[PDB]
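forwarding from the other thread:

> can someone predict this with protoporphyrin IX containing FE?

sure thing
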Amino acid sequence: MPQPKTFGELKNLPLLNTDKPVQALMKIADELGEIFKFEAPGRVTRYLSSQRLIKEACDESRFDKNLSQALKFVRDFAGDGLFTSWTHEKNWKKAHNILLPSFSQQAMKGYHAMMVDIAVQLVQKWERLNADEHIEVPEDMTRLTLDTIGLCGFNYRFNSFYRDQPHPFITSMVRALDEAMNKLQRANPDDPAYDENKRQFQEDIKVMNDLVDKIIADRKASGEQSDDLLTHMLNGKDPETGEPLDDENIRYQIITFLIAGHETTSGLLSFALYFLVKNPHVLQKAAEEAARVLVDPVPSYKQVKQLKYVGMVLNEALRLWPTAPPFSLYAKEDTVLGGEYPLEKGDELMVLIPQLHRDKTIWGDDVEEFRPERFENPSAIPQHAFKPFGNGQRACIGQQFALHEATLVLGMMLKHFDFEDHTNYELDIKETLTLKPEGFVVKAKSKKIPL
Ligand code: HEM
């Protein structure tokens, strides 16, 4: 099996000691091909980049979701929430059964108003900028997505558009996620050097737990019913076990929604706007749709569904730069991958999503080009060729939420403003848990359409 360059006893590990590991892995896939082994002291995995191999990896009878070391560290604060639990843990299937109906396309009808609440706040912020000011795109998109998940998730207002420094919960979450990431490179995690890191990590966990537990407590105490996920989780029963989610798991689910949803969704909106300003023909087409469809002061649920080309723009942005990181799988039993690669029970695979989305054998030779017209379309897309939301029963539960949010917001943005790439911005992709176009800025000239 092809394998990248080695660093003696550290094997391939220093290759991910970099600000941009996913992009580094994409460059390794370019020179090595559809499969490569990646080794670290005491660990091994296999990175998959072709639809040919990924299609097999997506066979749930042969492979199940694995928690990468990253997710294992994130579990220290995300607990046995949906994102960081194993399929075979009682709490996975229990929460999946309870939550699935609350995340359906139909359920988006109930979240729409609160999504509009935050989206209007974003539009108003931009309406209120002075002539010689610009927009920090990923920064504002993250304010939007955090507040939207906060409001829709547990009826809590982070009020991100009222501050420079985020709500302490947000600061703690971002810092806990960065520390979970830092542990990946620590050969001696018990070194005194990390004592402060550990102290801060426990502090950040407490900040998050305290806020969420308080909100849950407050809600049970009042008996208040809201249009949020928390109300669903307090009222829900798993048809299988007949059990409701306990308070601690509910807390983990709320933290999980924020971890899994905020940056992935923010990144999507940021990349979508990036591609639009770099492809003014596409922007014109999307803006025509936005103006024709969104005829009311605020968008209705029905109208968002009709933003078809905006949806296509978003899928094409997800094709080129899927914002969620490569996901991990393990072999359920001994099995041979692609007729060439025997695997043992427990062997791990990684699905290198951005590479899959550039499989010139699936998409044609023009994979690097931004063409929403690819998604006209749809479902002609070969099965397992487009996987920004993961796979099977362990796919993104929030997919309908993310797309409704992104379509609504992008539509409003295109209805309300003309955008200028005033710096001729050079794409620079920052990686945290997720990808974003770092330092992407634009100027927005209002079309002066009232809300
Ligand atoms: C463009 C935005 C998003 C993208 C690209 C994305 C991507 C993904 C991917 C790839 C997975 C599978 C991870 C794995 O196999 O380890 C996943 C799972 C998940 N996502 Fe999303 N996500 C997005 C938005 C959201 C939002 C907004 C929410 C919540 C409101 C959310 C909640 C979850 C949860 C709970 C899981 C675990 C589901 C389960 O395994 O039962 N995501 N997401």
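The domain at 1-451 is CATH 1.10.630.10 (Cytochrome p450). thats all i got for now
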